[PDB]
Amino acid sequence: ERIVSRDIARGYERIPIPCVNAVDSEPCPSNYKYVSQNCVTSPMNIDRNITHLQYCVCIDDCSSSNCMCGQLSMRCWYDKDGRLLPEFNMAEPPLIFECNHACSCWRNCRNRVVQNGLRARLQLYRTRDMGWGVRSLQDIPPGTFVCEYVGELISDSEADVREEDSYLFDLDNKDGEVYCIDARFYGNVSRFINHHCEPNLVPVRVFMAHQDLRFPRIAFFSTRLIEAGEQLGFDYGERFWDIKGKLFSCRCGSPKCRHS
Amino acid sequence: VERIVSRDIARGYERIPIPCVNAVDSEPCPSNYKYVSQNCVTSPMNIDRNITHLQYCVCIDDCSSSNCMCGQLSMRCWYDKDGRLLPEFNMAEPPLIFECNHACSCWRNCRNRVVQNGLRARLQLYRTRDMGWGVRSLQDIPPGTFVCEYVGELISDSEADVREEDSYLFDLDNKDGEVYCIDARFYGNVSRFINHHCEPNLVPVRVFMAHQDLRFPRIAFFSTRLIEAGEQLGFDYGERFWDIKGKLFSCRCGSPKCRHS
Numbered sequence: 001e002r003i004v005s006r007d008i009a010r011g012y013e014r015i016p017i018p019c020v021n022a023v024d025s026e027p028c029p030s031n032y033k034y035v036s037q038n039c040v041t042s043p044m045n046i047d048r049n050i051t052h053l054q055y056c057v058c059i060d061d062c063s064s065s066n067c068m069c070g071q072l073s074m075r076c077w078y079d080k081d082g083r084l085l086p087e088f089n090m091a092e093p094p095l096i097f098e099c100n101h102a103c104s105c106w107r108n109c110r111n112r113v114v115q116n117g118l119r120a121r122l123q124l125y126r127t128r129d130m131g132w133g134v135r136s137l138q139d140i141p142p143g144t145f146v147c148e149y150v151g152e153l154i155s156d157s158e159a160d161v162r163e164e165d166s167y168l169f170d171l172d173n174k175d176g177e178v179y180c181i182d183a184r185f186y187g188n189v190s191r192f193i194n195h196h197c198e199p200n201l202v203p204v205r206v207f208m209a210h211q212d213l214r215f216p217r218i219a220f221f222s223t224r225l226i227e228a229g230e231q232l233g234f235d236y237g238e239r240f241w242d243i244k245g246k247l248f249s250c251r252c253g254s255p256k257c258r259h260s
Numbered sequence: 261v262e263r264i265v266s267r268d269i270a271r272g273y274e275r276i277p278i279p280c281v282n283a284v285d286s287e288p289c290p291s292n293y294k295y296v297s298q299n300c301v302t303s304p305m306n307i308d309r310n311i312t313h314l315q316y317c318v319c320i321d322d323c324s325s326s327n328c329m330c331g332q333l334s335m336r337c338w339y340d341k342d343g344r345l346l347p348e349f350n351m352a353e354p355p356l357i358f359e360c361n362h363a364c365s366c367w368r369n370c371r372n373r374v375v376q377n378g379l380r381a382r383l384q385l386y387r388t389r390d391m392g393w394g395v396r397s398l399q400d401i402p403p404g405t406f407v408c409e410y411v412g413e414l415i416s417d418s419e420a421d422v423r424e425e426d427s428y429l430f431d432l433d434n435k436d437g438e439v440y441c442i443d444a445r446f447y448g449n450v451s452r453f454i455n456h457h458c459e460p461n462l463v464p465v466r467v468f469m470a471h472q473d474l475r476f477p478r479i480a481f482f483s484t485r486l487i488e489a490g491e492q493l494g495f496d497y498g499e500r501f502w503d504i505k506g507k508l509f510s511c512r513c514g515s516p517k518c519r520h521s
């Protein structure tokens with residue numbers, strides 16, 4: 001019903017992300033800053049030395065098995081349309097290394113999906129029972145990149161002293177150091193995606209312009225055909241529900257719900 | 261005959277292809293460097309990227325009014341509706357330009373965003389007769405248009421002072437504090453091929469977009485007049501270059517007002 005914003009991203013995405021409310025009188029969310037890429041407040045010494053990148057020397061479109069970046073990904077998982085292959089392990093996704101600016105290939109090679117940004121037509125909307133949510137305005141085939149989980153990159157020490165923990169995405173411990181993305185104060189459309197026990201999205205760790213393994217980027221891919229109008233959802237995991245289960249129960253409505 | 265030796269030296273990284281041609285000799289497309297479309301580093305530079313340190317505007321319009329904070333930092337917004345520098349822009353002593361950024365309240369299509377939109381002109385790398393490779397425009401370029409950025413490897417002054425090849429350095433001079441340099445010898449974009457001209461049709465301008473760390477301005481070339489289709493691009497290398505290289509060769513820009521021949 002009520003169109004309360006024509007584009008919450010104010011033109012920073014390749015297509016607008018409108019916001020509508022047909023439930024109550026809440027206006028468009030405004031208690032955060034929309035950013036389309038990750039940001040920092042305190043410094044994160046991400047390794048950006050260009051000579052530290054692994055890269056490929058392909059002269060084709062990076063469809064051969066000799067592509068170093070495909071080999072780092074165990075294989076290039078992207079088909080001719082940029083969708084994950086049917087055999088992609090959705091239960092335990094691998095890391096994806098996309099091609100980068102040190103590679104000899106062209107900017108339009110096969111192994112570049114997440115770095116081309118959001119393409120699906122999404123919409124922020126007011127749900128009946130769990131606040132704001134995100135839905136697709138179009139059919140999304142299986143294995144399509146939907147959106148990235150974008151926010152403020154913070155250390156574990158910083159996360160342990162933040163009053164609000166509902167917008168944290170853990171980049172769990174590759175070593176002693178561990179970091180997370182906090183979308184509470186800075187974030188993109190993904191900060192409004194609700195939990196579902198049978199999720200139509202799965203997060204995948206991706207490396208594009210750097211390969212600092214402490215700082216993967218979080219890309220959501222569809223696990224099935226998402227029909228037009230369907231709400232997006234992913235599995236928040238057990239750390240969330242072991243903390244928030246004390247306060248409320250899951251309202252995903254799935255007959256296979258595990259937290260209600 | 262004009263040999264096409266590359267369809268795009270940028271391999272698709274620019275909005276427009278930049279082909280390379282050679283009607284002079286049998287030299288192939290230059291390949292002794294790595295093309296990058298934006299600045300890179302090898303040793304860390306600790307650029308201040310704290311989002312709360314950005315100055316930003318709160319404009320409710322397209323940032324075309326007098327109240328835009330980012331225009332005020334630039335002493336005024338110098339861009340017209342087409343993204344070109346106003347005729348009042350001081351080409352002889354350009355001010356610092358602060359474009360709008362992701363902390364501003366405005367939209368991504370506001371007026372104060374030109375260099376962050378990337379290269380737009382149709383350019384061409386080509387073999388000259390007595391200057392090696394050069395860059396020309398394939399189209400008319402109106403005055404005050406953003407043409408290309410000087411892109412390369414960001415290095416410190418002490419690193420530059422131990423590099424054997426100095427012909428691709430762009431100085432980021434600092435009146436106070438540490439001084440840095442862009443070296444396009446090993447990593448660079450199309451701008452590393454632009455030759456010196458004593459009456460140049462390009463002027464470099466220091467611009468800030470995603471960060472405002474004054475140690476690291478980005479270098480944007482704007483046209484100083486109409487550049488016609490076919491014309492070679494050129495800017496003034498300055499005195500530090502010619503005080504060093506003038507001992508080896510004379511300027512061949514061919515201008516009637518050449519100052520280094």
Ligand SMILES: COc1cc2c(cc1OCCCN1CCCC1)N=C(C1CCCCC1)CN=C2NC1CCN(C(C)C)CC1
Binds near residue numbers: 163164237241243
């Ligand atoms: C509530 O759900 C989480 C809560 C916490 C999480 C992650 C959580 O959900 C992750 C998935 C759900 N997301 C929702 C949107 C996107 C995915 N992560 C951290 C990190 C764990 C490992 C890496 C370093 C810190 C621990 N702290 C947590 N809450 C504490 C914070 C500090 N105190 C008080 C001082 C307020 C209370 C408890």
Ligand SMILES: COc1cc2c(cc1OCCCN1CCCC1)N=C(C1CCCCC1)CN=C2NC1CCN(C(C)C)CC1
Binds near residue numbers: 439441504
């Ligand atoms: C030859 O032209 C330059 C030469 C030098 C420059 C700048 C120059 O031209 C700038 C304009 C021309 N460009 C051409 C393309 C784009 C603009 N910069 C400096 C400093 C760098 C950072 C601190 C302030 C200035 C260093 N010295 C330089 N050559 C020395 C380097 C070390 N070797 C040996 C010790 C190995 C001795 C010569």
Ligand SMILES: Nc1ncnc2c1ncn2[C@@H]1O[C@H](CSCC[C@H](N)C(=O)O)[C@@H](O)[C@H]1O
Binds near residue numbers: 130131191192
């Ligand atoms: N499946 C679910 N059941 C109940 N509440 C949920 C839920 N999924 C998400 N939420 C709510 O949404 C928060 C995650 S942030 C997701 C956006 C949120 N709906 C908003 O309006 O800002 C959780 O803290 C929880 O309060």
Ligand SMILES: Nc1ncnc2c1ncn2[C@@H]1O[C@H](CSCC[C@H](N)C(=O)O)[C@@H](O)[C@H]1O
Binds near residue numbers: 452
């Ligand atoms: N006006 C000029 N007169 C003589 N040589 C010039 C010149 N402008 C540029 N050059 C040459 O080009 C170098 C700058 S790098 C510019 C690209 C270069 N022509 C190339 O083929 O790689 C200078 O060191 C000088 O060798």
Ligand SMILES: [Zn+2]
Binds near residue numbers: 056057067068069105
């Ligand atoms: Zn490859």
Ligand SMILES: [Zn+2]
Binds near residue numbers: 062069098099104111
């Ligand atoms: Zn590659």
Ligand SMILES: [Zn+2]
Binds near residue numbers: 058103106110
């Ligand atoms: Zn590739």
Ligand SMILES: [Zn+2]
Binds near residue numbers: 196252253256257
């Ligand atoms: Zn559930």
Ligand SMILES: [Zn+2]
Binds near residue numbers: 317323330366
């Ligand atoms: Zn403004």
Ligand SMILES: [Zn+2]
Binds near residue numbers: 361
């Ligand atoms: Zn602004």
Ligand SMILES: [Zn+2]
Binds near residue numbers: 319323371
């Ligand atoms: Zn603006």
Ligand SMILES: [Zn+2]
Binds near residue numbers: 512517520
């Ligand atoms: Zn001259």
